[PDB]
Structures are given as structure tokens and as C-alpha cells.
Amino acid sequence: MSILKNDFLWGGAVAAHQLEGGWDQGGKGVSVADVMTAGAHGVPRKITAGVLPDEHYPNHEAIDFYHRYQEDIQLFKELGLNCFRTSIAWTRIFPNGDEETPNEEGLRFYDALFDECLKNGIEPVVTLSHFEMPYHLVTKYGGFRNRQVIDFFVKFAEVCFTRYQKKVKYWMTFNEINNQANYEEDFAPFTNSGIAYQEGEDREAIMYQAAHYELVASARAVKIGHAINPDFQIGCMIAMVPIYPYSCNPEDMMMSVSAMQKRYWFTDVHVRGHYPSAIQCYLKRKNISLDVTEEDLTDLANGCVDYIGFSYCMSFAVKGAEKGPTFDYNEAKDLVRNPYVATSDWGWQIDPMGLRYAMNWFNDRYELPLFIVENGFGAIDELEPDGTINDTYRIAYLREHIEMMKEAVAYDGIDLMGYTPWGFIDLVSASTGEMKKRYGFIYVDKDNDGHGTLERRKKKSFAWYQQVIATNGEEL
Ligand code: NA
Ligand code: NA
Ligand code: NI
């Protein structure tokens, strides 16, 4: 008698560049992740011009899942996962991106990884682009500044769909495609889109042009994937941070509406196949005049997604004072602390009820199945000398989010496909390039400086989630 559906997908989520290591093994090319240095809370990662001899790049070795995946999958099986969300490293398949033929050694690696999952009861869920495009596409072509990179991505997606059509049912095109709505900081444009900005450039206009090309690439991929296997479920991937009005002040309400339009118009294109009128009017008013053709609009219309994959970690709040009639939204400056919720040590506000809010926000608009493909609590873990990791703070975060997700299914009629907590084996964080910001049920002995045995150990949350899955979410 579970609230959640009987065939509910219980898994864990990672990304290739964040855990594989082997960054130059098996023919793999240099990715955008491979030129990003380690950072920390309050210390941005640095993006370097190629791999420089005297820098620490934590994604180069990560946790060495490239060599240890067989042992790790036995831990996944003990945990009881029925699915595993990861990315296919673009640079393992097309090392520089523009080769005529794919890299067969990279195609064999994912053959072996996916086969190892499926023989242990675990279904792979694959994200095609996850912050790891070939660095050669950036330096030579400009990343998604360039229409040519659309075809390079679609070529890559098509190889992947064809090779794994019998092994992978659930796909997603561009991870957290809307992160780049924050274009004032370098991280999201470079990792979403391969944009390295030159001095004096209009950063906003370049982001919107890359977002258009990516949406076109995704839509082309959807149609091609559907032609290869109509049983594929191909979703978008939205970073869903709800943006609350600070108060019932009417300008706070409109500021929140406008911020949500700026952050989530990507979803409308993915789902409906055309641009929403508010973002179109914004672009016209700002004279952001994108290279949009009629074939683009036809591609978008014919490549709508089957479901909405999204991450949830936190919520934001905004005030509308002095935001005038335009309610322009700069994510890097305009956020305010929400006095009603706690916050993590990295400053991510803790708001389990916002997950239910997020699910209703999607469902009110789109009536599509949802897939929670990332959710997690990044926190410092401590080893007791006895050896255990008592991460009750992580059980508390996760259990309250799963309870709110159950309330959304039970009370709001949401169609929820599955739940894959993020970083369920400790890996290198995206925003900061840290091992210290731990998400996992499985501890990995490696620190921010690169020291450690890389041994895996079970935290206390491991047995907690095992029983979550065992009871299909009834025992939290
Ligand atoms: Na208040
Ligand atoms: Na901070
Ligand atoms: Ni080796």
C-alpha cells in the first residue's frame, strides 16, 4: 500500500566527469571539466587555458570509477538501486568532437558499464551532455556560439542512441540547461555551453544564442532518438530552484513571476516546442536578436520531450522594491535570504516543502511525468576511529524531501517516475571542485587536496536508504 507507484525508479545519480577519472585513458579527449581547477565555498574554481602544469584539476582522477566500477556496482546492488543515472562522457566518444567516426574504445567502456549495471538489476539512465563537452569544440569552434556544434552534438547523440538502444530506456539531453540563466558568473556559461567570454562582450546575448542552439540540438536529438527506438523516454533536465516572493507585496509577487520566466523559459521550449511570449518580448525589448531560422522552429516543434527531469536542492527568495516596471533579474545579485528556512554550510537553503512546490509548478503548467534526477545534501563528513560515518544530517535532509515528494503524489496527483539522489557515492562537486562537500551514502577516502586511499565505506545513511527502497518509500 505505498503512496509511490509500484514500478518506481529508485536510484542514484552521478556524472562521468565527477567520478570516472581516467581523464586521458582509452582515447578520451580533454573536456571542459578537465581545465577547471579546484575551488571551495567562497572561492570560485578557475577556468584555465588548456591543462597547465602547476594546477590541481580534481576531475582528472576523481574517484577512479573508470577502474573500480565493478566493485562500486556491487555496492549499488547491495544498496538496492533499480536504476543508475550517469552521463556518457562526450569526450570518450568524440574526443575532440568533430571526428568523422566515434572512438570505439569509449563505446566499449559504456557497453561494459551498462552491461555490468543490467546484470545486477540496475537500469542505466543516461544524460547526454553533463558539463563535459570537448575542450576542442570550445577553442576551435566557440562551443555553442557556433551552429556547427549543434550537428556535432546530434552526431554524438545519434551514435549513443544507436549503440545503447537495447540497454538504455531513459535519456536526457542537456543537464541543467537553465543554469546559464546566471550568465554574470563564468561557471554556468562555460559548463552548460562552452562559452569562454572575451572582454567587452555582451554576456547575456551570447548565453541566449547558445541556449537556442542547445534547445535546437536537443529537439533534433529527440526526433532522431524516437526514430531509433520509440520506446525511448527522452526528457529535459531542468535545475529547479523555486523563486519565492518575499511577501505578498504586489511588486514582490511580480518580481518572483518575472524571475521564474527568466529562469524557466527553457522548459516551455523543451515541453511545448516553441518560445513563450514573455521571454520573446524580453529579447525584443533588449534587442537580443538571435539567429533563429524556420527550420529551427520546425525542429523545436517536432522534438518536444516525454518527461521533465529536474534537480532540486534549495529555494530562493526575491524582493521587488525598486525593480520598477521591468523586473529585470540578475541571479548573481538579486537574491535575498529566506528567514523561514535553514541553510547548508555552502549556503544552499534547506526547503523540503519547496520540492512539493516545484513539482506543482511543473504540473500546473505541463501535465507531464516528472523524474527527480538529482536531490542531495552536501555536507562535511567525519570518520569516527571505529570507522563509521554518522551522517544523520543527511538522512534528515533526504527523508524530509522524500516525504514532501510523497505528499505531492498523494495530495497533488503528481505523476512521479522515480528518485535518484545526487552524489550517492562521494564524488567531485561541480560548483566547487571539492571532495569535502560530500553527498554520498558511500564514503570515499579522498580529500580536497587529492590525498587518500580512495577506499569506499558505508555511511549510516546507506542502511537508511536501503530500507527506503525496500519499502518503496513507506519507511522513512
Ligand atoms: Na517576514
Ligand atoms: Na557563501
Ligand atoms: Ni587502466
Short mmCIF file of C-alpha atoms and ligand atoms in Angstrom, two decimals:
data_model
loop_
_atom_site.label_atom_id
_atom_site.label_comp_id
_atom_site.label_asym_id
_atom_site.label_seq_id
_atom_site.Cartn_x
_atom_site.Cartn_y
_atom_site.Cartn_z
CA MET A 1 0.00 0.00 0.00
CA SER A 2 2.66 2.53 -0.97
CA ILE A 3 1.92 6.11 -2.00
CA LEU A 4 4.53 5.87 -4.75
CA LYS A 5 3.85 3.84 -7.88
CA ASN A 6 4.76 0.16 -7.84
CA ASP A 7 7.39 0.35 -10.64
CA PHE A 8 9.01 3.43 -9.07
CA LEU A 9 12.61 4.06 -10.18
CA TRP A 10 14.84 4.23 -7.08
CA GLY A 11 18.42 5.04 -7.97
CA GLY A 12 21.37 7.31 -7.54
CA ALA A 13 22.80 9.98 -9.80
CA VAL A 14 26.34 10.94 -10.86
CA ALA A 15 28.11 12.50 -13.84
CA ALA A 16 31.03 10.95 -15.75
CA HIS A 17 33.50 13.81 -15.19
CA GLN A 18 32.67 13.93 -11.49
CA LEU A 19 33.55 10.31 -10.68
CA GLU A 20 35.22 8.42 -13.57
CA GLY A 21 38.75 9.71 -13.59
CA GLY A 22 40.77 8.13 -16.37
CA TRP A 23 40.59 11.57 -17.95
CA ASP A 24 43.15 10.73 -20.67
CA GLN A 25 42.70 6.95 -20.76
CA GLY A 26 41.17 4.90 -23.52
CA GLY A 27 41.49 7.66 -26.10
CA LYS A 28 39.42 10.23 -24.19
CA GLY A 29 39.87 13.87 -25.17
CA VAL A 30 40.22 16.91 -22.94
CA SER A 31 36.81 18.11 -21.75
CA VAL A 32 35.76 21.47 -20.30
CA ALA A 33 35.76 19.80 -16.88
CA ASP A 34 39.43 18.90 -17.35
CA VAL A 35 40.53 22.57 -17.42
CA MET A 36 38.67 23.60 -14.23
CA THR A 37 40.69 23.82 -11.03
CA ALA A 38 39.57 23.01 -7.50
CA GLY A 39 37.78 25.68 -5.53
CA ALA A 40 35.83 25.93 -2.26
CA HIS A 41 32.92 27.66 -0.57
CA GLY A 42 33.55 31.33 -1.36
CA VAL A 43 36.45 30.51 -3.70
CA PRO A 44 35.42 30.10 -7.37
CA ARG A 45 37.01 27.44 -9.50
CA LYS A 46 39.38 28.79 -12.12
CA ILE A 47 38.98 28.04 -15.82
CA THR A 48 42.42 27.65 -17.37
CA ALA A 49 43.57 27.86 -20.99
CA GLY A 50 44.21 24.17 -21.50
CA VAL A 51 45.71 21.90 -18.87
CA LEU A 52 48.53 23.82 -17.11
CA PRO A 53 51.45 22.04 -15.41
CA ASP A 54 51.19 23.63 -11.92
CA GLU A 55 47.44 23.37 -11.21
CA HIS A 56 45.25 20.84 -9.42
CA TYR A 57 42.44 19.56 -11.65
CA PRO A 58 40.30 17.33 -9.39
CA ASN A 59 38.32 15.79 -12.28
CA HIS A 60 41.45 14.19 -13.76
CA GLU A 61 41.42 11.33 -11.25
CA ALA A 62 38.09 11.97 -9.40
CA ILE A 63 37.35 8.70 -7.51
CA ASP A 64 38.65 6.42 -10.32
CA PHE A 65 35.27 4.80 -11.06
CA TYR A 66 36.72 4.15 -14.53
CA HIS A 67 38.79 1.35 -12.94
CA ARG A 68 36.64 0.47 -9.93
CA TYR A 69 33.12 0.39 -11.40
CA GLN A 70 32.70 -3.37 -10.94
CA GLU A 71 33.28 -3.14 -7.18
CA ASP A 72 31.20 0.02 -6.90
CA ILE A 73 28.27 -1.61 -8.72
CA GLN A 74 28.32 -4.40 -6.14
CA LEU A 75 27.82 -1.66 -3.55
CA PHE A 76 24.99 -0.24 -5.70
CA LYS A 77 23.37 -3.68 -5.80
CA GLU A 78 23.63 -4.10 -2.01
CA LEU A 79 22.04 -0.65 -1.67
CA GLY A 80 19.15 -1.98 -3.76
CA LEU A 81 19.12 0.55 -6.61
CA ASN A 82 16.99 -0.38 -9.59
CA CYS A 83 18.48 2.40 -11.70
CA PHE A 84 21.69 4.39 -12.07
CA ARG A 85 21.82 7.86 -13.58
CA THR A 86 25.11 8.87 -15.18
CA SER A 87 26.40 10.66 -18.23
CA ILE A 88 28.13 9.33 -21.31
CA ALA A 89 31.36 11.33 -21.49
CA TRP A 90 31.17 13.22 -24.79
CA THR A 91 35.00 13.21 -24.97
CA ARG A 92 35.13 9.42 -24.63
CA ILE A 93 33.01 9.03 -27.78
CA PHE A 94 34.19 12.03 -29.83
CA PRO A 95 37.43 13.13 -28.14
CA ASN A 96 37.70 16.47 -29.95
CA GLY A 97 34.07 16.47 -31.13
CA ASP A 98 34.49 16.85 -34.88
CA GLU A 99 35.81 13.42 -35.89
CA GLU A 100 34.02 11.55 -38.68
CA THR A 101 33.96 8.25 -36.73
CA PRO A 102 33.44 7.68 -32.99
CA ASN A 103 36.05 6.28 -30.62
CA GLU A 104 35.39 2.56 -30.38
CA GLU A 105 37.31 2.16 -27.09
CA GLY A 106 34.98 4.67 -25.45
CA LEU A 107 31.90 2.95 -26.87
CA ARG A 108 33.20 -0.31 -25.41
CA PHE A 109 33.65 1.23 -21.97
CA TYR A 110 29.98 2.18 -21.74
CA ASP A 111 28.98 -1.18 -23.22
CA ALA A 112 30.79 -2.77 -20.27
CA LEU A 113 29.48 -0.30 -17.68
CA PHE A 114 25.85 -0.61 -18.84
CA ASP A 115 26.12 -4.41 -19.10
CA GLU A 116 27.54 -4.53 -15.56
CA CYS A 117 24.59 -2.48 -14.31
CA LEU A 118 21.96 -4.59 -16.04
CA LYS A 119 23.33 -7.95 -14.88
CA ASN A 120 22.94 -6.65 -11.32
CA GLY A 121 19.32 -5.46 -11.65
CA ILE A 122 20.16 -1.81 -12.35
CA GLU A 123 18.78 0.16 -15.31
CA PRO A 124 21.02 2.94 -16.66
CA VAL A 125 19.50 6.40 -17.06
CA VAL A 126 21.74 8.47 -19.37
CA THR A 127 22.36 12.22 -19.65
CA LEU A 128 23.98 13.08 -22.98
CA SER A 129 25.56 16.45 -22.09
CA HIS A 130 26.65 16.91 -18.46
CA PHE A 131 29.19 19.77 -18.17
CA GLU A 132 31.84 17.89 -20.15
CA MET A 133 31.85 18.95 -23.83
CA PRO A 134 35.15 18.56 -25.72
CA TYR A 135 37.52 21.43 -25.00
CA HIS A 136 38.46 21.31 -28.69
CA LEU A 137 34.92 22.40 -29.55
CA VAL A 138 35.47 25.46 -27.33
CA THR A 139 38.85 26.55 -28.65
CA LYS A 140 38.27 25.85 -32.34
CA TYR A 141 34.53 26.46 -32.81
CA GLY A 142 33.41 28.59 -29.86
CA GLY A 143 31.25 25.91 -28.24
CA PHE A 144 27.58 26.65 -28.61
CA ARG A 145 28.32 30.09 -30.00
CA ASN A 146 28.59 28.07 -33.22
CA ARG A 147 25.78 26.48 -35.20
CA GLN A 148 28.23 23.77 -36.27
CA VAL A 149 28.31 22.44 -32.71
CA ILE A 150 24.58 21.60 -33.00
CA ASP A 151 25.41 18.99 -35.65
CA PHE A 152 28.38 17.73 -33.61
CA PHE A 153 26.10 17.14 -30.61
CA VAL A 154 23.42 15.45 -32.71
CA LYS A 155 26.05 13.20 -34.33
CA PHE A 156 27.19 12.22 -30.83
CA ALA A 157 23.63 11.66 -29.55
CA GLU A 158 22.80 9.52 -32.57
CA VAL A 159 25.85 7.28 -32.05
CA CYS A 160 24.84 6.83 -28.40
CA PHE A 161 21.16 6.10 -29.14
CA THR A 162 22.14 3.54 -31.77
CA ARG A 163 24.79 1.74 -29.71
CA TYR A 164 22.74 1.50 -26.49
CA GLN A 165 19.19 1.21 -27.84
CA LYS A 166 18.69 -2.18 -26.18
CA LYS A 167 20.27 -1.19 -22.85
CA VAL A 168 19.08 2.35 -22.05
CA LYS A 169 15.42 3.36 -21.96
CA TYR A 170 15.55 6.73 -20.18
CA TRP A 171 17.60 9.58 -21.62
CA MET A 172 18.05 13.30 -21.03
CA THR A 173 19.68 15.76 -23.42
CA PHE A 174 21.29 18.77 -21.64
CA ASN A 175 21.93 18.65 -17.90
CA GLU A 176 20.51 21.65 -16.02
CA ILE A 177 20.29 23.60 -19.28
CA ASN A 178 18.88 26.63 -17.41
CA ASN A 179 21.86 27.07 -15.05
CA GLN A 180 23.26 29.54 -17.57
CA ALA A 181 20.42 31.97 -16.81
CA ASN A 182 23.11 33.15 -14.37
CA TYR A 183 25.47 34.42 -17.05
CA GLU A 184 27.26 37.06 -14.95
CA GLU A 185 29.44 34.36 -13.41
CA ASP A 186 31.66 32.24 -15.62
CA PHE A 187 30.71 28.76 -14.38
CA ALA A 188 27.33 28.08 -15.99
CA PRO A 189 28.11 29.55 -19.48
CA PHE A 190 31.35 27.59 -19.70
CA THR A 191 29.93 24.25 -18.45
CA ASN A 192 26.47 24.47 -19.98
CA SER A 193 27.63 25.85 -23.27
CA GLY A 194 31.37 26.04 -23.89
CA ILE A 195 31.25 29.85 -23.71
CA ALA A 196 34.59 31.45 -22.77
CA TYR A 197 33.93 35.19 -22.69
CA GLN A 198 36.23 37.85 -24.14
CA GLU A 199 36.48 41.26 -22.50
CA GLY A 200 33.73 43.69 -23.51
CA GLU A 201 31.31 41.05 -24.85
CA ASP A 202 27.55 41.12 -24.19
CA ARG A 203 27.48 38.09 -21.92
CA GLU A 204 23.67 37.89 -21.82
CA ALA A 205 23.13 37.88 -25.59
CA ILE A 206 25.74 35.15 -26.10
CA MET A 207 24.07 32.97 -23.44
CA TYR A 208 20.65 33.24 -25.10
CA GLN A 209 22.12 32.38 -28.50
CA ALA A 210 23.82 29.29 -27.08
CA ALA A 211 20.66 28.30 -25.23
CA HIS A 212 18.74 28.49 -28.51
CA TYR A 213 21.27 26.29 -30.31
CA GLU A 214 21.17 23.78 -27.46
CA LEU A 215 17.37 23.65 -27.48
CA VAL A 216 17.55 23.05 -31.24
CA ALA A 217 20.18 20.35 -30.71
CA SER A 218 18.04 18.69 -28.04
CA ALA A 219 14.94 18.72 -30.27
CA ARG A 220 16.82 17.22 -33.23
CA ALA A 221 18.15 14.57 -30.86
CA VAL A 222 14.67 13.78 -29.52
CA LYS A 223 13.27 13.14 -33.00
CA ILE A 224 16.29 11.06 -34.05
CA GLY A 225 16.17 9.06 -30.83
CA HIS A 226 12.46 8.39 -31.30
CA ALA A 227 13.09 7.10 -34.82
CA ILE A 228 15.73 4.70 -33.46
CA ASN A 229 13.59 3.34 -30.58
CA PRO A 230 10.04 4.68 -29.99
CA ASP A 231 10.13 3.08 -26.53
CA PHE A 232 12.86 5.56 -25.51
CA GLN A 233 11.73 8.09 -22.91
CA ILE A 234 13.70 11.30 -23.64
CA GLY A 235 13.38 14.10 -21.10
CA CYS A 236 14.74 17.53 -20.50
CA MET A 237 16.79 18.31 -17.40
CA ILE A 238 15.90 21.49 -15.51
CA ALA A 239 17.66 22.85 -12.43
CA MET A 240 14.50 23.67 -10.48
CA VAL A 241 15.13 26.35 -7.86
CA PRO A 242 11.74 27.86 -6.92
CA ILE A 243 11.96 31.64 -6.54
CA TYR A 244 9.54 32.88 -3.86
CA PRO A 245 8.23 36.42 -3.45
CA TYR A 246 9.50 37.77 -0.15
CA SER A 247 5.98 38.89 0.83
CA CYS A 248 2.50 39.49 -0.53
CA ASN A 249 3.68 42.96 -1.54
CA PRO A 250 2.46 43.13 -5.15
CA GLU A 251 5.86 44.11 -6.52
CA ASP A 252 7.38 41.09 -4.73
CA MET A 253 4.79 38.89 -6.44
CA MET A 254 5.59 40.29 -9.89
CA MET A 255 9.34 40.14 -9.27
CA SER A 256 9.00 36.42 -8.50
CA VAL A 257 6.89 35.87 -11.63
CA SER A 258 9.47 37.62 -13.80
CA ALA A 259 12.40 35.75 -12.25
CA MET A 260 10.66 32.42 -12.86
CA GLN A 261 10.11 33.40 -16.50
CA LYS A 262 13.82 34.26 -16.87
CA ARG A 263 14.96 31.04 -15.23
CA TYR A 264 12.49 28.54 -16.72
CA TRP A 265 11.54 29.60 -20.26
CA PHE A 266 13.86 26.76 -21.32
CA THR A 267 11.22 24.33 -20.04
CA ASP A 268 8.49 25.82 -22.23
CA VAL A 269 10.58 25.26 -25.38
CA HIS A 270 11.53 21.73 -24.30
CA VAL A 271 7.92 20.79 -23.49
CA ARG A 272 5.72 22.78 -25.86
CA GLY A 273 8.10 23.20 -28.81
CA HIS A 274 8.01 27.00 -29.16
CA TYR A 275 9.13 30.07 -27.24
CA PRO A 276 6.87 31.59 -24.56
CA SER A 277 5.71 35.10 -25.28
CA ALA A 278 7.21 36.74 -22.18
CA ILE A 279 10.79 35.74 -23.00
CA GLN A 280 10.23 36.69 -26.66
CA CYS A 281 9.10 40.17 -25.58
CA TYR A 282 12.10 40.45 -23.25
CA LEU A 283 14.52 39.60 -26.06
CA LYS A 284 12.84 42.07 -28.42
CA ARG A 285 12.94 44.83 -25.78
CA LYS A 286 16.64 44.12 -25.11
CA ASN A 287 17.30 43.81 -28.86
CA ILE A 288 18.80 40.37 -28.28
CA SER A 289 18.29 39.22 -31.86
CA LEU A 290 19.07 35.52 -32.13
CA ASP A 291 19.96 33.54 -35.25
CA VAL A 292 16.61 31.72 -35.44
CA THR A 293 15.55 30.11 -38.73
CA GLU A 294 12.35 28.45 -39.86
CA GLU A 295 13.99 25.01 -39.80
CA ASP A 296 14.92 25.74 -36.16
CA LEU A 297 11.27 26.35 -35.26
CA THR A 298 10.20 23.19 -37.08
CA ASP A 299 12.90 21.18 -35.27
CA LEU A 300 11.77 22.56 -31.89
CA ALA A 301 8.13 21.77 -32.65
CA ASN A 302 8.97 18.15 -33.54
CA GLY A 303 11.37 17.49 -30.66
CA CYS A 304 9.25 18.01 -27.53
CA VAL A 305 10.34 15.90 -24.56
CA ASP A 306 8.49 12.93 -22.98
CA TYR A 307 9.06 13.90 -19.33
CA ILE A 308 10.67 16.58 -17.19
CA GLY A 309 13.80 15.53 -15.34
CA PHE A 310 14.89 18.02 -12.75
CA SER A 311 17.17 18.61 -9.85
CA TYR A 312 16.05 20.06 -6.56
CA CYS A 313 18.34 21.27 -3.79
CA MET A 314 17.04 24.59 -2.49
CA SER A 315 14.78 27.57 -2.96
CA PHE A 316 15.44 31.28 -3.49
CA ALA A 317 13.55 34.42 -2.49
CA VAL A 318 13.39 37.87 -4.12
CA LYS A 319 12.17 41.38 -3.29
CA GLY A 320 10.62 43.65 -5.91
CA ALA A 321 11.41 47.02 -4.33
CA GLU A 322 12.80 49.42 -6.96
CA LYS A 323 12.60 46.76 -9.71
CA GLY A 324 10.32 49.18 -11.47
CA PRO A 325 8.14 48.01 -14.32
CA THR A 326 10.76 45.77 -15.98
CA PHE A 327 11.55 43.46 -13.04
CA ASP A 328 14.88 42.54 -14.59
CA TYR A 329 16.50 39.62 -12.76
CA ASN A 330 20.23 39.21 -12.04
CA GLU A 331 20.61 35.95 -10.15
CA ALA A 332 24.14 36.82 -9.03
CA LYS A 333 22.92 39.93 -7.13
CA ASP A 334 19.14 39.99 -6.58
CA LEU A 335 18.57 37.06 -4.18
CA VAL A 336 17.65 37.53 -0.52
CA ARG A 337 17.92 35.24 2.48
CA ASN A 338 14.68 33.44 3.35
CA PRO A 339 14.25 33.91 7.14
CA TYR A 340 11.94 30.87 7.42
CA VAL A 341 14.43 28.13 6.43
CA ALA A 342 17.86 26.86 7.40
CA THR A 343 20.87 26.79 5.07
CA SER A 344 23.78 24.43 4.42
CA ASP A 345 27.44 25.22 5.08
CA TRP A 346 27.76 26.08 1.38
CA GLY A 347 24.82 28.47 1.75
CA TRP A 348 22.20 26.36 -0.05
CA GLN A 349 18.86 26.95 1.67
CA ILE A 350 17.11 23.84 3.03
CA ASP A 351 13.45 23.78 1.96
CA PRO A 352 11.89 20.33 1.61
CA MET A 353 8.44 21.85 1.10
CA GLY A 354 9.84 23.67 -1.94
CA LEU A 355 10.21 20.27 -3.61
CA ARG A 356 6.45 19.83 -3.45
CA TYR A 357 6.13 23.42 -4.66
CA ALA A 358 8.48 22.69 -7.58
CA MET A 359 6.53 19.59 -8.57
CA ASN A 360 3.27 21.55 -8.59
CA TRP A 361 4.90 24.38 -10.56
CA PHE A 362 5.77 21.93 -13.35
CA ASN A 363 2.49 20.01 -13.18
CA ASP A 364 0.31 23.14 -13.21
CA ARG A 365 1.93 24.16 -16.49
CA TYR A 366 2.78 20.99 -18.39
CA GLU A 367 0.92 17.87 -17.15
CA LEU A 368 3.99 15.71 -17.96
CA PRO A 369 5.51 12.91 -15.86
CA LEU A 370 8.32 14.14 -13.62
CA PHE A 371 11.61 12.48 -12.68
CA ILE A 372 13.59 13.77 -9.69
CA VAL A 373 17.05 13.01 -11.07
CA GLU A 374 19.08 14.97 -8.51
CA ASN A 375 18.48 15.76 -4.83
CA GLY A 376 21.08 15.80 -2.09
CA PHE A 377 22.64 17.39 0.96
CA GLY A 378 26.26 18.45 0.54
CA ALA A 379 27.92 18.43 3.95
CA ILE A 380 31.14 17.66 5.79
CA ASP A 381 31.51 14.06 6.93
CA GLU A 382 33.63 12.89 9.85
CA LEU A 383 35.12 9.45 10.41
CA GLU A 384 34.91 8.09 13.90
CA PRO A 385 38.01 5.93 14.54
CA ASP A 386 35.70 2.93 14.91
CA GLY A 387 35.20 3.66 11.20
CA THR A 388 31.56 4.68 10.84
CA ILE A 389 30.14 7.88 9.36
CA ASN A 390 27.17 9.18 11.38
CA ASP A 391 25.55 11.42 8.77
CA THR A 392 22.19 11.93 10.46
CA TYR A 393 22.15 15.45 8.99
CA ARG A 394 22.00 13.79 5.55
CA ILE A 395 19.27 11.32 6.48
CA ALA A 396 17.25 14.22 7.90
CA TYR A 397 17.51 16.30 4.71
CA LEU A 398 16.72 13.38 2.42
CA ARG A 399 13.90 11.88 4.48
CA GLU A 400 12.05 15.18 4.61
CA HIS A 401 12.42 15.70 0.86
CA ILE A 402 11.13 12.20 0.13
CA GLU A 403 8.20 12.87 2.47
CA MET A 404 7.30 16.05 0.58
CA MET A 405 7.66 14.24 -2.73
CA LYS A 406 5.24 11.61 -1.39
CA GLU A 407 2.82 14.36 -0.33
CA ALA A 408 2.92 15.73 -3.89
CA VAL A 409 1.97 12.32 -5.30
CA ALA A 410 -0.68 11.61 -2.63
CA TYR A 411 -2.34 15.05 -2.42
CA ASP A 412 -1.48 16.90 -5.65
CA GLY A 413 -1.86 13.98 -8.10
CA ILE A 414 1.70 14.33 -9.47
CA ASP A 415 2.91 11.57 -11.81
CA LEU A 416 6.38 10.83 -10.39
CA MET A 417 8.61 8.40 -12.32
CA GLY A 418 11.49 7.97 -9.88
CA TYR A 419 14.00 9.47 -7.48
CA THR A 420 17.81 9.42 -7.88
CA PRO A 421 19.67 11.19 -5.04
CA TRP A 422 22.71 13.14 -6.18
CA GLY A 423 26.30 12.15 -5.47
CA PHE A 424 25.21 8.96 -3.72
CA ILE A 425 28.83 7.83 -3.83
CA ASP A 426 31.10 10.71 -2.80
CA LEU A 427 32.41 12.43 -5.93
CA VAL A 428 34.00 15.71 -7.03
CA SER A 429 31.47 18.53 -6.66
CA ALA A 430 30.53 20.61 -9.70
CA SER A 431 30.24 24.14 -8.33
CA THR A 432 33.39 23.97 -6.22
CA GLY A 433 35.51 21.04 -7.45
CA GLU A 434 35.65 19.64 -3.90
CA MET A 435 35.68 16.21 -2.34
CA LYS A 436 34.93 17.92 1.01
CA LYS A 437 31.33 18.75 0.00
CA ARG A 438 30.07 15.21 0.41
CA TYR A 439 26.71 13.93 -0.88
CA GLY A 440 27.12 10.17 -0.65
CA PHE A 441 25.68 7.18 1.09
CA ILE A 442 29.11 5.69 0.29
CA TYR A 443 32.15 7.43 1.73
CA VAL A 444 35.26 7.66 -0.48
CA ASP A 445 38.58 8.37 1.24
CA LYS A 446 39.88 11.34 -0.76
CA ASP A 447 40.14 14.97 0.33
CA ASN A 448 40.21 18.37 -1.37
CA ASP A 449 43.97 18.21 -1.88
CA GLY A 450 43.89 14.79 -3.56
CA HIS A 451 45.21 12.70 -0.65
CA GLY A 452 43.67 9.38 0.38
CA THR A 453 43.34 5.64 -0.28
CA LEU A 454 40.11 6.02 -2.35
CA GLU A 455 38.62 3.19 -0.25
CA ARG A 456 34.81 3.01 -0.16
CA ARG A 457 32.91 2.68 3.14
CA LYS A 458 29.21 2.68 4.02
CA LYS A 459 27.86 5.66 5.93
CA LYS A 460 24.89 5.39 8.29
CA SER A 461 22.63 6.82 5.56
CA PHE A 462 23.42 3.73 3.47
CA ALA A 463 21.28 1.43 5.62
CA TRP A 464 18.63 4.15 5.82
CA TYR A 465 18.22 4.40 2.03
CA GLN A 466 18.40 0.60 1.63
CA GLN A 467 15.24 0.42 3.72
CA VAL A 468 13.66 3.36 1.89
CA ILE A 469 13.96 1.35 -1.34
CA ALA A 470 12.97 -1.90 0.36
CA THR A 471 9.62 -0.44 1.43
CA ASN A 472 9.08 1.64 -1.76
CA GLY A 473 9.34 4.79 0.32
CA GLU A 474 6.96 3.81 3.11
CA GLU A 475 9.61 3.55 5.85
CA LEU A 476 11.47 6.88 6.02
NA NA B 1 8.68 38.07 7.05
NA NA B 2 28.52 31.69 0.89
NI NI B 3 43.76 1.23 -16.66
#
